[PDB]
Structure 1
Amino acid sequence: MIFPKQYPIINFTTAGATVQSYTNFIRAVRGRLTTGADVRHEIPVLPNRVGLPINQRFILVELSNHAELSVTLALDVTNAYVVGYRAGNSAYFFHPDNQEDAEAITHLFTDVQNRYTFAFGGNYDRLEQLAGNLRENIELGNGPLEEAISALYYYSTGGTQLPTLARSFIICIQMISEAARFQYIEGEMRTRIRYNRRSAPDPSVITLENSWGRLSTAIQESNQGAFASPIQLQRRNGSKFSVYDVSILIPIIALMVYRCAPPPSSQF
């Protein structure tokens, strides 16, 4: 047999990548993460986890290498989170947050011979501890990505040490999930690809990543766009930047996590 559907796959390679091919990739990931059901202040909202059928729950990102290697990451559509990956005959999942997530990930990579669930979760704090480095000290760009794809591919066979695996996840998550979430972070990665120059993320990138949930909730709870409480971000040079309203974020955030139902008066 072969029980219906199967999750959408988007392909990207680091080999010969360009600003245009990376832009096409991120646009496609955003297109599979959202449905068009839910747009607030011109900003798409991800599907609500509540009642979402398991057949619509994930997307697959197949990454390949100039080294001719390929790994497939699985992203949860509710939050763009990388929940695990497959490399040939092994799959690995981060420790699930709850029982319902544990069941859901049994629907991924269902014919791999070897399935493992890490005993650690996949949040940045945990991965930074394992990597022995913070995000601010881990270079991003097309070279880091090419190297991360090889690292994930060789984990099975003892080639990749834990610290290097956790660093490689840190690279993938920011270059795929965070770029999908934020046009600003997609733009940061386009710069590094255009000049083929790797560099660690500056405070503007890091404070956006750390603030995604808070900004999603502040936008969704706003009064016609106005925040009850401002949110402080940082500029590139580390100086503070106060956000009072959704308006200044329209060019910056591309997707929000679903927090609250939209109040009457906005998709009519």
Structure 2
Amino acid sequence: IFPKQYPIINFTTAGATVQSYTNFIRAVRGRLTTGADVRHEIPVLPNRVGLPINQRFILVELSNHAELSVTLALDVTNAYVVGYRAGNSAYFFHPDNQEDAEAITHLFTDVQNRYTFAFGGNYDRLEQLAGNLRENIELGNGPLEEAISALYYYSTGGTQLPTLARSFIICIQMISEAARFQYIEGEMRTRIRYNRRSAPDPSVITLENSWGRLSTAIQESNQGAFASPIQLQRRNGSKFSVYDVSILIPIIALMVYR
């Protein structure tokens, strides 16, 4: 079996810096936005429809101080993690539809063991499996180091499901959500700068929750003006309304097709 070859971007927590993390997220954004183009200075990710299988995925190869390596597969249509490989096993989130189920059969096709979880990659179920909300799961280089080891050792049963789910929540936010939002990239750069370890505040969590709604609102807008306002949160958890794309141009880096 000679598998389909997808673009690969490398990141290591070993000696990570603001620069190396910045280079990584910019490279991930680069390979996500080669298809489709810009609306209000914000790139729209390729549409699911008509996209050849050979262009459907990018791979993120993560290494850590323990010199363990896992490869995450990201769907170029939404920047989100669909599955990963560690050694001779690949693990996939439960696909949402028959089309996505067929598409992921093209990933890691030479791997000896394929596993598909009963749960999807959505935070609601991952938080239940982890035994914590995103607001109580620390992010930073330390959590990412640990998450890489946890994903690696699941291949041999060394990792318990709650720790695997916690580890997915860490990787998704520090990779997918950072690619999607300059604001969240900024949050992760700040943690790395100050060698910090801290849970995302409500501003980050509400942006993650609102990515789909913001993508639709911006693309359906009358030259930037929303048909309905969108409620986001400040760092202190208070709600404000957004009526227009302007304030979001520095915040949101990528949108899903509307």
- Note the aligned Cα RMSD (angstroms): 1.1
In structure 1, what is the equivalent of residue 169 of structure 2? 170
Give the Å deviation of 1:172: 0.2
The aligned runs of 1:75-154 (5 Å cut-off) are 75-154=74-153
Distance (whole Å) between structure 2 residues aligned to residue 16 and residue 3 of structure 1:
34
Q: In the TM superposition, what is the alpha-carbon distance from 1:4 to its structure 2 partner? A: 8.9
Is the contact made by 2:43 and 2:253 (CA closer than 8 Å) also made in structure 1?
A: yes
Q: Is the 8 A contact 2:58 2:76 kept in 1?
A: yes
Stretch deviating more after TM superposition (11-20 or 29-38): 29-38
Percent identity of equivalent pairs: 100
What's the CA shift for 1:3? 6.5
Q: Give distance in 1, aligned partners of 2:127 and 2:228.
A: 30
4 and 158 in structure 1: CA distance in 2 versus 1, 3 angstrom threshold = closer
The secondary structure found in structure 1 opposite 2:85 is strand
Give 1:158 shift. 1.6
Distance 1:89 1:36, change over 3 A: closer
- Residues in 2 aligned to 1:201 and 1:83: alpha-carbon distance in whole angstroms: 22
* Deviation at residue 214 of structure 1 after TM alignment: 0.1
Q: How many residues align structurally?
A: 258
The offset of 1:47, in angstroms, is 0.0
Deviation of 1:98 after TM superposition, in Å, equals: 0.7
Alpha carbons 2:7, 2:31 under 8 Å: kept: yes
Whole-Å separation in 2 of the counterparts to 1:241 and 1:203: 12
Q: CA deviation at 1:237?
A: 1.1
Give the C-alpha shift of residue 35 in structure 1.
1.6
> What is the deviation of 1:241?
2.2
- Displacement of 1:37 in angstroms is 3.4
Cα deviations by residue, 1:157-191 (Å, 9 ceiling, x for unpaired): 12100000000000000000000000000000000
- 2:226 is aligned with 1:227: yes
**For the residues of structure 1 that align with 2:127 and 2:211, how far apart are their CA atoms?**
18
1:122 is displaced (CA, Å) by 1.2
1:17 touches 1:142 (CA, 8 Å); kept in 2? yes
Answer whether contact 2:3 2:106 (CA < 8 A) is retained.
no
Secondary structure of 2:95 counterpart: coil
SS in 1 for 2:67: coil
How many angstroms does 1:55 deviate by?
0.4
- 8 Å Cα contact 1:44-1:256 kept in structure 2: yes
Hey, what's the Cα distance between the residues in 2 that align with 1:166 and 1:249? Answer: 30
Asked if structure 2 preserves the Cα contact closer than 8 Å seen for 1:179 and 1:186, the reply is yes
How has the CA–CA distance of structure 1 residues 159 and 4 changed in structure 2, closer, same or farther, with 3 Å as cutoff? closer
The answer to whether the 8 A contact 1:36-1:44 is kept is no
2:195 alignment partner, SS class? coil
Name the residue aligned to 1:253: 252
Q: What is the deviation of 1:223?
A: 0.5
When normalised by structure 1's length, the TM-score is 0.94
Residue 69 (structure 1) aligns with: 68
Q: Do the aligned partners of residues 158 and 3 (structure 1) sit closer, same or farther apart at CA in structure 2, a change above 3 Å counting?
A: closer
How far 1:53 moved relative to its partner? Answer: 0.6
CA contact (8 A) 2:70 2:148 kept: yes
Long gaps (5+) in structure 1? 260-268
* Distance apart, 1:27 and its partner CA: 0.3
- Whether the 8 Å contact between 1:7 and 1:58 is mirrored in structure 2 is yes
> Which whole-Å CA distance do the structure 1 matches of 2:240 and 2:180 have between them?
19
Q: What SS class does the counterpart of residue 177 from structure 2 fall into? A: helix
How far apart are 1:51 and its partner, in Å? 0.8
Structure 1 residue 5, shift from structure 2 partner: 6.3
Match of 1:186 in 2: 185
Asked whether the 8 Å contact 1:231–1:244 carries over to 2, the reply is yes
2:155 partner SS: helix
Helix, strand or coil at the partner of 2:115: strand
Q: Secondary structure at the match of 1:10?
A: strand
Runs of 4+ residues deviating >4 angstroms: 2-5
